[model samples]
Structure formats: structure tokens, C-alpha cells
Target chain A: NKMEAKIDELINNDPVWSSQNESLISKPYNHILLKLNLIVQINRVMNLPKDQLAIVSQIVELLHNSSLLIDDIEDNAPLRRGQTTSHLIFGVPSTINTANYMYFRAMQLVSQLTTKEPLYHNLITIFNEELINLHRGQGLDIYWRDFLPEIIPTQEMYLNMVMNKTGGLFRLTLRLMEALSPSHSLVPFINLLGIIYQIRDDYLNLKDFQMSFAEDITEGKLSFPIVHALNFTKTKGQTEQHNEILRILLLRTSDKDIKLKLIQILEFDTNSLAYTKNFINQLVNMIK
Target chain B: KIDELINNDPVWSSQNESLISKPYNHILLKPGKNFRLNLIVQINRVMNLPKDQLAIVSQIVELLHNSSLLIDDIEDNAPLRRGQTTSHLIFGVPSTINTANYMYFRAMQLVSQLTTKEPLYHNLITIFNEELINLHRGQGLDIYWRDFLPEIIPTQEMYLNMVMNKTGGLFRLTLRLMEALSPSSHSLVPFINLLGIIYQIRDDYLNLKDFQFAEDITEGKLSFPIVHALNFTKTKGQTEQHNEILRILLLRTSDKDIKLKLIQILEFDTNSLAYTKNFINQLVNMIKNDDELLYIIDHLS
Candidate 1:
């Protein structure tokens, strides 16, 4: 297609960026197509015009993929979409730079969504504000993970974190589309969608049979169920279980049996797995 | 940059004392000359923007530059900046990276404050957005070659293109934002872009020429002079010398004699040290004799 060719020309014009490196950066992007296409299709009911949706899709796609690239490095993740991560393939320094580079490139695409001055200013403001929130949310997650056992957040605290961390990009997309759409009441819905998506993501990382590994456990992620399990055991004065979960998370082990044992604690000791699945369904029902 | 910002806008002082702002305050412990702000002020003599508006522009540039330094030190794995420990060294990488990136958005928020007029604000944001993208793209390429060394050997022309993106981004961002907010549309971009290229190339040359042990070599950066030396040796088919230069570079050693040995190779074998100095002087001289450009000559000294 002409789009692929156009990308080739742009990368070719630069003496620094090689066609090969372009493909490396583009790998995560190409893998993200089906998800973005789903977003575009779902937004069709809102009557956000196709061309505008495409622009939004482009911006969100870049930001999402860029975040994934960095998230892996920050978490020391090895596999992304069942292949070696960009950082692993290209090395950490190059991958980090390129991911940050793509973020600014995404910001540039916002200008294309509108040409009128006032609207343009608002779009940039929205872009700036949400990215700040995204980083703040991401910062807290990384802080908790890197400094494991320093802080164990309660469910209330974890939800607030999700509002900032997950709600950021979700709000950014829906907010932009609402600004341009003929009619809207979708912000709260998008916020709900984000919370559900994040929680499900946390649940599935351990439970998803499709995955090669329980990466969240290996990466010491303070996922929703883990957070719930930690607090539940603490509240019940099950100090042994609380300390055991903390110990496993800090180990950051890839041992499958150890990960399954922790999952077993969540299922039997705290019933957090059932609690989280129930909570996810309740949030989804609120949307309907 | 902080003096102008805090003096003009209360927002600068508001959260800077908080835990999150600790890393930022530590890095600003010793500030350098706000040369970019000086350029805006000198050029403002022609455009006559008010003191308050000019302060906002200065704050934006300061934030971008400081945040960039924090990240650059991490990416380059350099230990010292302005003779003090780099932010990442003091605060750890996760906190430093997050704080630095958070400040970029904070800088972006200030663009709306540059003007109330929608049209001018729009233009100012465009300049800010475009230049930041260019800055990152240039940085991305630079990091790529260094991290994946020997995979790509860039020519001098390739190095210049990267500089135009990397160095020129900051210079052009400052100039373009000021130009957009000015009463008269005097074009300073072309001149600033040239200054940006010259300034970076000069810095690259000076890092090797004058540093006590040359941290650039220790960082294994594919700097301007290094790139020239690599290509110069390659073109001449000096395979052993070419291989030796890369071997020492990939070593990333801070050892004095080792760095000295590498510098001597550039100085004597490839003659790139002299070649780089000559090119920087030529770039600067092209603007000399014009009163409009006299400011740069004084700053370079």
C-alpha cells in the first residue's frame, strides 16, 4: 500500500534512520493494528467521522505502542506479543530513545486532527494534560514495583491509581473524539472501560492460558488481584499469608510453580480471584 | 531560567518543594548561563515583547533544557553534569526519568500561557511541538548508532543531519516560539538553525579537545569528531586503526591513558580533531561581520 511506501520514503530521507531501524520501531505498531481497528469500529456508533477517527486511531496507536515498549524495559520484561521486545532486539538505550521519540511524533499528529486555531489549542491542551496524568500514574506503578515491600496499597488506593494511570489515555481518546463529535456523553463510559480493561489485564496475566508466562508475577507487578489479596490477608490478620505474598513478589521469580502457589493463595486463602472477577463484571454491568 | 519563571509565574514555586520535585531541585542545584533566554532577550530588542510574556518563554526553554539534561545523562550513562552528580546518579533512574518526563508536560502546559489570542497560541504550540519531535528524533538516532555500534557507520553528512534535528530543535524551538509571539515577524530560524549546528559541532569538538579525560569517549557516544574519525579512517582503508578506534570506544573506559590514546588517534592518524575545529570555525565565520550575528561570537568564547 501507499502508506507503507510513504513510510519508507520518510525514513529513507533521513541519513540517521535506516529502513531496518524503521521496521524495528514499527514492529510493535504493526502488531497493534487489530486492537486499533476495533477501537475505530466501536467509535463508529458515536458518529465520529471516519477520517477523524483514523487520526485519533493513529495518535492513540503510537502512544499505546510507545508505552508498551517502555513498560517492558522498565519491568525488565522479555517477551512482548510473544516475541522478543524491542529493547531486547535493538538494545535498551535505542529502544528507550525510539519509544520516547514516537511519543512526540504522536503529539505532532494531533495538529492534523484540526486546522482551526481555537480548537487546535484545546486539542494540544488535552494532549498535554492527559500525558502528564499518564506519566504520574505510570510513575507510581514503577515506584511501587521497583521499591517492592516499601508500600502495599489498599484497594481504595489502588483504584485511585488506576483512575490516574489507566483513565489517562482512555480519557484522552474519548475527550478528543467528543470534542469533534456531533453529540456526546461518553467520557464516563470511557473511564469505566479503562478500569475494566486494566483489572482484566491484571487478572488475565496470571490466568490467561494463552500466555506463555504469568508475567505480572514475574515482573513483581502490583496487579489488582494481588493488591486485593495483600490487603485481604492483612485485614484478616493472616500475617503469614501477607508476608508470603510479599516474599514471592520481591523474589521476582519466573518459577512457574511459585507463581501458581501465589495464585492458589489468592484463590483459597483470600478468594481474591473470584472477588476480582465479580468486581470486573459489576463494573462492566454499570456501563450497560 | 528558574529566576525568570518563579519571578513571573507563581506556578513555578508552587509544587517545587514537594517530594516529586526533589530530583528537579537537586539538578538545578547549580545552574548554567541561560544562553537561550539571552538569545530571546537580544532578539526581543527588535520585537519589543513585554517583560512578563518574555519571562514565560524563558521558563519554557529552561524546563525543556533541564528535563532533557536529566534524561540525556541517563541515556548516555554520564556521571557528571556541570561538575556535579547527574540527576539519575543522585535520584535513581526510575524517579529521574519520570520526573524529567513529567516536567516536559508541565512545560507544554505553559504554552497556553504565552498568549490569550487563539491564533498566536496555536502558532506557539506548533513551534513547541514540532521542535520537541525533532529533538527526540535526532536523539533517537544518536542513541541508536551508539547502542548498536558497528551496525551503522554514519558519515559526516549523516552526523550533520542528526545535529540539525537534535541541536537545531532546541535553538529553533526557542527562536520560533519567540518569533510567533513577536509583533514583527523577523525570521531568526535560519540563523538560529545555523548557530545550533555550529554550537553542537563546537561542543563535540571541545569535549575531546579540552575535557580533562574526555567523558564523550567514556560514554562511547558517536559524537561529531568521532564520527568524522571513523569515516575518515574507513575511507582510507586503514582497517586496523579503524578497528582499534571502535574497540576502545566500545570499552567505554574512563581510564586516562586509554582515552588519551584514542584522542591521539583522532588527532594524528585521522586528523579529525583539526578537521572538526576547522568546520566549526567555518560555520561560525559565515555569520560574522554582520551586527545581527555578533552576539553568537561573544557567547562562543
Candidate 2:
């Protein structure tokens, strides 16, 4: 509450500066606001201060906005949050300009926040490592989608990739929080927390038992649960059906009921959750 | 006005005391005439270095910026910059990305051939690689945050964190460069760090408070001020509340209706708008009251 209150107070007290930018700022407040709210909520529950949250929220939102803007250009996602994406609104060049500017602005926040607390310094590490992990992971994921389906990676391998690819950030969130908590123990705990969260997410990719609420595979997201299940389910021919499911998941738009049925079939046969629990246990031990 | 929100609108067209410099000609990637001037100014004001080596360091910054831009455009799928198409956008993504890589190759060649090695080739390479890693990780995080947390504040935070690596790293590098280049034996790392932070915070403040940067809305950037404001709201208004602005900005982003409202709160005391901006200021003021930051700065510097 204090954190949110502070953010609100600051925005209200400032002047609305105007510029000759191709236009005023673009982007719905959805994602950034979610981070802010969570920071506030977490702070409220945890009684942590606002410095790291502010820095993290500001930092994440800035990068997120730029990435989304660019990704729209990359994936050619025409609509974002019920509106034409930034590139569509401002044209590619302008969107690019805005994305760079936003990114720079985000960095500025990092500079300011880290200055506030040396404890926040660890963030420099997060930015350095996590991006590389994501690049490697995304590169692999993209390769998998574009190239060979027959080269099915082991579930452990897929988990290894996606967890780093996807879960790298989940870990970053908790790790950053722990680093700031003033308790040395919290940092390691938070790091593990990230792993646990991602494990469950990976586990969910197949069975949808818990948090990794992946819909049936239309998007080619060889999500954790599905990848894990496919690895465990011994039948060789089933791999073809699974890969087909992955392709279909890639092409899906909004209507996903059919996909859900498919997910049920895969998860039901494999009991992805059991596998997920096993992974989570392993992750828990590692964190300990 | 692609130059919208610029502090120096028609910046070169100003009828100031100074006469026009050399006539302008569009030179893609050839170091626009303003490039040298900006770097010179930066060297003087920011770098606090002598002009003799201005060309060298400025060239270094430009080289690095161009190199990253080339690569970044492809990675980000960005299409434009400075009102012209991005290198990747104009050229193919592969070509552009590779060109960025080429830039690195060339930069290394230049480093190897440089007359002096103050920062040294090895240090430069290490820093460059590390920064690149940071940039990619920042981008990776950006990609992740973009998919999972579509909500404004959360996404904005992720975006800002990305900025830390993607953008701030440059500022950091700049400072490190200064530390490496400064004639003094003593390093100004701490002072440079403060300066960089000042620049970053000012940029964040401008994005939220500057009318010039009202495009923050169109970009959906969760700049601190905006994130702070959103969190304070008791409940997000799904019906014509916050959603109205998003829709308006989306459809007619270039227009000013929603941006006006965003600024209205920041400028006025009404509704205690944008909770974090004010709170951060208050926190800063409180911190200042204790003279804590000044002390830290003094010791750090």
C-alpha cells in the first residue's frame, strides 16, 4: 500500500511534459501496473520497503514495454491490449524510436535505484546473466519451432531450456527481492523460490494441474509439463502426435476449447503433475 | 513531428545568436555533423576530459552505439531510428544483425590499432562482452516479462530493469570510460556513477512529467512515475477507468486527449495522482532531510 501510494503520489505531483515525439507515449498500463500492484501487495504482506520494488517495477516495465513494442514488430502481433500495437499506431520507425527511448529511460531508473541502496547492486548481475540465458533459450525454442520436430529434446533438456528461458525471470524477481530483504538467507531462498515457481510452471505445461496454466499446445511452446510428459511417455509414435499438437498450439488464436481437450488427453495419460512434483522436489533440494 | 517531445524542437533551426554551422546533408551512418558536436559537448561537460582525445572517445561511443543499434534493431525487430529506417529495417535483419556483429569486429580492429591502450584492448573486450551479455539478458528478461506480465506496472518494472542493462549499461560504460580515460590518476567512478544516475532519473522524470515525452503513454512504458501512480489507486477501473485511456491512446495515439489527462494529475494536486512519483520525491526529501544521500555521495565520490 505504501509503495503504491508513493508511486501515485509522485505521478500526481509532477508536470505533464509535452514533446515533439511522433506522439505522446503509447502502451496500455496493464503489464507495468501489474508489477507495480504486486510490488505494493508483496511489500504490504512482507513489510518490505519500496526502494527495490520501485527500481524493479520501473526497470521491468521499461524493458518490458520496449521488448513488447519490438516483439510486435518481430512477431508481427498487430494488436496489443485491445488496441493496435505500437508499431501499427506509430509506424515501424517511430515505434523503434520510442522503444529505444523507453529502454534508455528504464536504464535511467536502474541508475537511480541502485544509487539508493547498495543492496540493489546485485541487479547488475541479474541483467547481465538473465538476458544471455533468455537469448540462448529463445534461440533454442525458435530453432525447435522453425527447424526439426523429429529432434525432440529430452523433457529434462526442454525443461533445462525453458526454465532458463522462461523461469530465468521468475528467479530474477525473487532473487532481487531476497537481495533487498536485509536477510542474507533471503537471497538464496528467493533464488530457489524462482526455481520452484518455474518448475511448477513447467509441470503445468502438460497437465495444467497448477500454476503453469498453459493451454493445449497450439503455439509450439514445448512448455515444461508437455515436454516432461512426452519425455516420460515411452511410446515413440506418440512423439509425432505431440509434435503435431505443438504445431497446432503455435497457430492458435483465441478459441482454445479444442486445445484444452488435447491437453487433457496428453496430461491425463502422462500425469504431468507427478513428474512436476518430482522436479520441484529436486529444485527444492538444490535451493536448500 | 517525428522529432516530437524533443527539448530542441527544429533544434537546428533555432534563431539563436550563433550562425548556422556547416550546411546539413543527410549522411546515413557517416556520423551526422551534429554527432561530433554532441560528443564534443559531452566530452567537455560529462566526460570532463580534454578536447585532444575527444575524437577518439567519441568515435568509441559512436562505434559502440552503432554496433549495438545494428544488432539491437534485429533483435528487437525495430524498424526505425532518428526518423529513418533502422539499419536492420532498411537492410535485412540478418544483414543488419551481422553488420552489428561486423561493427564489433571493426571496433576490435580499431581497438587493436589504437595508438594507446589506456583502457587496454583486453579490458575493453571484457567490458564489451559483459555489457553485451547484460544487454541480451535485459532483452531476454524483456521478452519474458512481455509475455507473462501484460499488466502495466509489472511490465513497466520489467521494462525498467531491462533498461538498466540495455540502456543504463551504456551510461555505466560511459562512466567507466571516463574513469579509464580521465587524465587524473584518481578514478572518478563514484562521481561518474552519480552523474549517470542523475541522467537516468531525469529521463524517467521527463517521460512522465515532460509534455514532450507524453508518448510514454503510446509506448506503454511503465516509467517509475506511472508505475507509482497506478499502484496507489484503490482499484483499477476496468470500465472507462484506466481502460478508457488505453483505448484512446491505442486508436488515436498521436492525439493528446489521454496524454492531457495523464499530465493533468502530475501537474496538479488533484486526486493525489500517480502515487509513486510523489512518494519517491517525499522519500528523497526525507532522505535528504537526514542528509543521507549527500553523505553517501560524499563518501562514494
Candidate 3:
């Protein structure tokens, strides 16, 4: 509760930030639990003072929320966390500006973490490197999705992309903490978590029944299982099956029957669903 | 939708790089007047560094300026930039926005190449961060006013402040970085700030004056002249003209006749057109002595 309260004070203290973001501040869809827990656990190891740790948490939170706002726009998602997306309510123009604005605001918070010039430079460098990686990874993902069938990535290619895109924020947190901490870095471990987290998320977008439908299929996304299913079909000389998969993806259909048909193809025909589940489990088991 | 044979790709190749950068390439092929670069060149006379470092600075600015236009076109829903189809229109908005934001970070990464010294590096990064933040804050206000029109109407003073942030952002970013790097410290910020205001106001005036169709009118932008016309009509109690201008802007019309009518109102009723011309001159006269700066202003005019 105190952490949440401190985050609130940080947001409300800035007039420009609060004006655009106050409504978006308390949404239930926040990834606060994962981020807060990770930082707290790391703090136990490094023993960063409480106040500096708070600043780091706030910076990550701001970048995370801002990215979601832009992500929703790029995905053309109408709803986020079962509520109307910010771009839908605020309009894309305001939403884009506010999200971009918050990135710099988060950058500004880094100086407050230290007064020593060298340490400050290192902190800023960490921030810059991860942000660049995040965008590079995100850029490739958008390119592949938009220009689909032009470049169908293999599973290895997809894994590398995830390491850059998803691992970016995860590494940003750990890198910043390690830089501050009087502490093999959890970086490799965090990278593993990022890959697992994304692959699991990709798996669930198709498998999870709580969602209204297989949203990734509707988005024509090249997810982990979808990549596996496509490659598996191709290597086995399943021409009609491969062509059918291509057709459904190109259609960008939201029909329940069509989406289910593709899901079943992954389930039994290619066994990609089983493959993805086992892969996720293997990655998780590595942590132990 | 027949599929090509699946290939095992283990790395991001040049083809991948080219595919992701399609939007940036689309706009970069059609260059704008290198006004920002020219300003940098002119200012370098005062803050001369080695040619190599200056070239890097120019590259950083060019990346930022062009990338920002890619985004601005998307944000404005602009169909064209520099008389060519906008990147977003061809490549689509999702890729375009991601590409533009990626270039922004790439520009930030270029800062380290400027200096190896930690203290100077920190100062350079701070300058870059501060100006970019100002740029967005300025842009945020501009977008808010246009999208949420009739919710709040800005006065002349408010519009200028926004210009200083919005237009001044890149201009100041260039000058500030140069000043930080220069061995001889001359305060050129005030001069650059005034130049930014003049540049934007001049741009606003030209949109209504030179164009066959006033695109700003179509976009419902609260530009400098438009701001004056708005407040002019309101303060003079010209309710008919005031509400009509608001009506036309609200309509977001591209119809030449309707846009011409709005232009006529500014020309005759509000005198906003002449008023803006005079205002630009008064500001230009403030920096009339600097031949290099004036040459740039003359080209813009």
C-alpha cells in the first residue's frame, strides 16, 4: 500500500503528467505486482537504500505504462485490461504525445538517483541502451506482422527477437539495480524469465479461455506456437495444411469458427500447442 | 496466400534492417530544405569544433528532425510531406510510429560518440533530455488544443509559448549541444529562441497565405495567425465571424470554397493575415543584424 501511495504521489506531483495520465493511473491491468516483487527481491540481495529503490521502481513503472499506451495504439486494440484503451478515449494524437512525454519524464528521474557524475552517466547509459534495444526489437516485430508472409521467421529467429524486445525491460530493471547495488548477474536469469514470460503470454493468447477469442490470430500475429505450427507443417510437406494456415492468417479473421479451426490445427495436426507448453515448462524448470 | 519454403534464420540480416526501416527511408528520400543543418553550419562559426565532430552533430540533428516529421505526419494524419506521400500512408501507422520512435533512441545513442569524458557526456545528455522533454510538452499542448477544440481556446501569448516549446525544441537542442561543446562560450540561446518563434509564426502565416488550399484550416490547427484571428474576432464581439471560424475548423473541411471563406474572414474581418505579417517582421527585425541568420529567415519567407 505504501509503495502504491508513493507511486501515486510521484504521478500527481507533476502537473503535465497528471493532467494527461491521472485517469490511466489506477487501472487494474497494471503489471505492478511482478515489477514490485522483482525489485524487492533484488533489494534483499543488493541492499540498495529504500528511497533510491523507490525512484528506480517509479521510473520503470512510468516507462511500462507509457509503452502500453503506445502498444495499444500500434496493435489497434480497442480494449486493454477489459476496459477502453487510452488512445480510444483520448484520441491517438494526444495518446501518442502523452506516452512519448512520459519517456523523457522517466529519463529525467535518473538524475535524482545520484549526484556523482560517473555513476549518473552509467545510469543514463543503462537507460539509453535498454530503450534502444526495446525499440529495435519492437520495430522488427511490427515489420514482420505488417508485412506478413514476406518474412516468416523461424523459431530461433523468434527467440532472438524476444530476447531483445521482452528482455529489454527485464534487463533494464536488473541492470539498474546491479549498477546501484554493492552486488553473474541476475541478468542472464532475468533474460530467461523474460523469454518464458513472453512465450507463455503468446501461448495463452491462443489457449486461454478467459479471453473473448484468440486475439493474436485476429491480429495476424506470428506468435511462438504459430511459428512452430507453420514451420512444422512446411518441413513435413503438408502443402494444403501450410497454405490453409497462410490463408487464415492473411484473412485476419475474427470469426470464432475460423479461429478455432486454426487453434485445432495447432492442437492436433501440428502438435504445436503441446510443443509450446513443453517448451515453456522446460524454460521454467531451468530456473530451479 | 501460398507460402514460401521455410528457411532457418538465426540472425537479423540487412534485409531485416531494410524491412523495418522502410518508413524512415520513404521520407528520407524526399529531403526538406536543410534549414536546421544550415542553422548548425552558421552557428558553428561561433563554436568551431573539428569538422568530424560537427558532422556527427549534424547527423544527430538530421535523424531527429526527419524522424520527428515521420511521427508528426502520423499524428496530424497528414497525407503528404515535402510533396510526397507520407510514410505512414504507404507503410501503415504501426510500423511508421515504431520506426520513428526507434530512430529517436538511436539519436540519443549518438550522444556518447560526441564525447568520452564523463562530465561533458552527462551535460550533453542533459541538454538532449531537457529539449526533447520541452518539445513533447509543447507538442502535447498543441495536439490537445486541436483535438479537443472549443474545450479551450488559446490566446496569442499562449500560442507563442507553445511555439517556443514545439518549434524551439529542435532549434534550441542544436544550439545548446554546440554551446556545451564549444571552447568559447557565447550565449546564443536567446537568439535561437527568437529564431524558433519567428520560424513557426512564419510557417503558420505561409500556410494560409501561399497555399492553394489552407491545409491548416483543413487540419483545424490552432496556428499563430489562426490564434490571432480567433482571439481577434472574440474580443471584438464579432460573434458571427468568431463562430463561423470555429464552425469551419470543426468541420475539418478540405473543400476549397469553404477554406477560402475562412481565409477571407482572416483577411478582411479579423485582419489576422496582415497582423501576422507585421508580427513576423517585428520579430525578424530583432535578429536583423546577423546576416547568416537573416539569410536562413529570407529563404524560409
**Per-model TM values vs. the true structure:** 0.87, 0.44, 0.91
* lDDT tens digits by residue: candidate 2, B42-102: 5455445666555555566666666665654444444455556665444344223323433
Q: Chain B alone: TM-score in each candidate?
A: 0.92, 0.57, 0.94
Candidate 1 on A1-288: residue-level lDDT in tens? 353343233333422445764664444445433337656765776578778888999898888888887777777888877677766766666666677777888988988888887788778877887888777777777767767787787776566567667878888887787677766365556666777899999999877733348879988889999999988988999999999999999898999889888988888889999999999998777656
Candidate 1 chain B — worst ten consecutive residues by lDDT sum?
B4-13
Consecutive 10-residue window with the lowest summed lDDT within model 1 chain A: A6-15
Per TM-score, the best of the predicted structures is 3
Candidate 2 - CAPRI tier?
incorrect
TM-score of the A-chain for all models: 0.86, 0.61, 0.87
Model 3 accuracy (lDDT, Cα):
0.80
All models, DockQ values?
0.25, 0.01, 0.31
**DockQ-superior candidate, 1 or 2:** 1
Q: Cα deviation of B11 in candidate 3 (Å)? A: 6.0
Residue runs of model 1 more than 4 Å from their true location after superposition = A1-38, A41-44, A209-212, B1-22, B89-91, B184-186, B291-296, B299-301
Per-residue CA lDDT of model 3 for A1-288, tens digit only, reads 353343233222222233443333222223222227989997898789999999999999888888888887887776667777877777888788778878888999999999788788789889988887787778777777888888888887788777767878998898899999877677777777888899998999898843446878877888999999989999999999998998898887879899999999999999999999999998788776
Error of 1 at A112 (Å): 2.4
What is the per-residue lDDT of model 3 for residues B145-222, given as tens digits with 9 covering 90 to 100? Answer: 898798878887667667777888888889889988987644777767777877888888988999635789889999
Best by lDDT: 3
